[PDB]
Write a protein that binds this ligand. Structure first.
Ligand SMILES: *[C@@H]1O[C@H](CO[C@@H]2O[C@@H](C)[C@@H](O)[C@@H](O)[C@@H]2O)[C@@H](O)[C@H](O)[C@H]1NC(C)=O
Ligand SMILES: *[C@@H]1O[C@H](CO)[C@@H](O)[C@H](O)[C@H]1NC(C)=O
Ligand SMILES: *[C@@H]1O[C@H](CO)[C@@H](O)[C@H](O)[C@H]1NC(C)=O
Lengths: 106, 160, 50, 160, 160
């Protein structure tokens, strides 16, 4: 006797289809990324400008507490923390702040 | 069901005869199936060519309507991609499984075509020979060269 | 960190090339599209029925 | 053509023999077809999961460019959804109809496989028995248990 | 392979017999195939119904965030359409080719059904008659009217 068959294995991977659900298949790939490395990286070869505890207004105006920040010659993006509270120290209206932030972003 | 003992390709044959037994992958079929699947997966990924973008936008408290427009834009794109992606996966998974089912169906028919009236169709992909079919005979069938006329006399004598 | 990427999100950089991601909607770079889905598993093989 | 008198399922059999006649749905096939269709329809609807939104936006007479941008956004989304929806419906309707055609084709082949040389393939889904095949015989065929060897003598005697 | 000499339709027959030889398109099949393809192509084009729009927008140097939003909108729409269009073309081209393969497969089966045991299935779409089958006989087969019983005596006598 000669018989035609197919491969089976120990895969427990299942997929869904339009007609049926939980179909176990022998080989499977993702189209979806659910991992990241937990790090802020150089983007396209260029390091970000991290401002520590300062925001952009603080950094560009020279808030005394932003004095310790280094000056970057170039950067790919700007990073501020959720706690980047040191901005304008003498209260007032920083005009067209959002446009300035966009211009300095890269 | 499949053979958990056959790990040299997706499709293949198993046999038992007077001289021995075992299995081997049909690599003509398996490689064609692989090229098909590989091209399919790659097209799904390789065609979606994006550019450098920056998604986030910043607005002040008197620009609520603009921020909301920006959200509207993000939401529409998100719903479109999520939905289309789910349909693409579900549709392709069904097509993939049919493709695989097609390739193995094709192999059965090729064997049946060569064997004609010299073997019984019994099931589980099996053709029961009505004549002695030794290792040389079975390899000849798998390779598309079964010389049907030299086995037809024996096949009928074992049935008459 | 002294690392490099092609796509960056606030939770960390994405190393990878598949078409979709479910990590974060706000990204900078040549990024996968954000989806709400938790699984886009595309079969390459046949049904695993032994 | 179909049977307007068969309303107990999508697919089924009709017979005529010495002991009587009638029809019944093949509920193995019909239920599988139903689960297939049900999952398909539900995936089309159930995967399109939207959030709470507010579409309308208001702009003044010196914001014409923004209102026009908002329109641009609505129009692009509208064209995408309308077009994709039309293609999805047209594509699925063809696939649906092929699926149904597949399921009934499969039943024909299962019957043919059991009957082998004991019945003639005549048409209109019909297998003409070459031997007496009473109600017990026909139920056995429909259920996948036809005991072919006990009918092969009669089938050949009625042809010799 | 196909016939470069057959230019009167997509599908058809070629024959050789005692009275002559030649080919002709099967226009029942070809026209149905054409209507299928025509409807398919037209639906792809005819359903994508756009309105009058104006894409370009102008912003000043203090509106960079808005210009960038406008770009974001254009880019998302562009990626969606480019990708979906590539998938639509790749998917339909495979379905188109399967459709064509289906239609010619159907013709083979219709011929086989009429000929039954009066011809050998040899390959290259060919049925070798076991009896004389002149031009009238072959036209009868192509038209679905082969009167099988009048040829069965000759077919068996040439084999006994
Ligand atoms: C689909 O399967 C999901 C994963 O569960 C696995 O497969 C099912 C069929 C069960 O065998 C289960 O024990 C396995 O872990 C389920 O979470 C899911 O609920 C299943 N169907 C759905 C989506 O409801
Ligand atoms: C990216 O990082 C690798 C180390 O993993 C290094 O070899 C390469 O030069 C870096 N590229 C750029 C543009 O800095
Ligand atoms: C991460 O990036 C490196 C290049 O620095 C590359 O060699 C590696 O394959 C990437 N990892 C993944 C999972 O894509």
């Amino acid at each position: 006797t000669l018989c035609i068959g197919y491969h089976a294995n120990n895969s427990t991977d299942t997929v869904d289809t339009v007609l049926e659900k939980n179909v176990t298949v022998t080989h499977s790939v993702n189209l979806l990324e659910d991992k990241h490395n937990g790090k802020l990286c150089k983007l396209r070869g260029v390091a970000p400008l991290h401002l520590g505890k300062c925001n952009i207004a603080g950094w560009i105006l020279g808030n005394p507490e932003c004095e310790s920040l280094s000056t970057a010659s170039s950067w790919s993006y700007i990073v501020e923390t959720p706690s980047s509270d040191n901005g304008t120290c003498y209260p007032g209206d920083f005009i067209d702040y959002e446009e300035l932030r966009e211009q300095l972003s890269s | 069901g499949g053979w958990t003992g056959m790990v040299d390709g997706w499709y293949g044959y198993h046999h038992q005869n007077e001289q021995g037994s075992g299995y081997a992958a049909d690599l003509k079929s398996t490689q064609n199936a692989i090229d098909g699947i590989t091209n399919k997966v790659n097209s799904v990924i390789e065609k979606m060519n994006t550019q450098f973008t920056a998604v986030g936008k910043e607005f002040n408290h008197l620009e609520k309507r603009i921020e909301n427009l920006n959200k509207k834009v993000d939401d529409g794109f998100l719903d479109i991609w999520t939905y289309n992606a789910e349909l693409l996966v579900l549709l392709e998974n069904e097509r993939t499984l049919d493709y695989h089912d097609s390739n193995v169906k094709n192999l059965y028919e090729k064997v049946r075509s060569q064997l004609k009236n010299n073997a019984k169709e019994i099931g589980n992909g099996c053709f029961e020979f009505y004549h002695k079919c030794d290792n040389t005979c079975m390899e000849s069938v798998k390779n598309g060269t079964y010389d049907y006329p030299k086995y037809s006399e024996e096949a009928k004598l074992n049935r008459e | 960190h002294d690392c490099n990427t092609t796509c960056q999100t606030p939770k960390g950089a994405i190393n990878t090339s598949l078409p979709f991601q479910n990590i974060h909607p706000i990204t900078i770079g040549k990024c996968p599209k954000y989806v709400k889905s938790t699984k886009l598993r595309l079969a390459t093989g046949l049904r695993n029925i032994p």
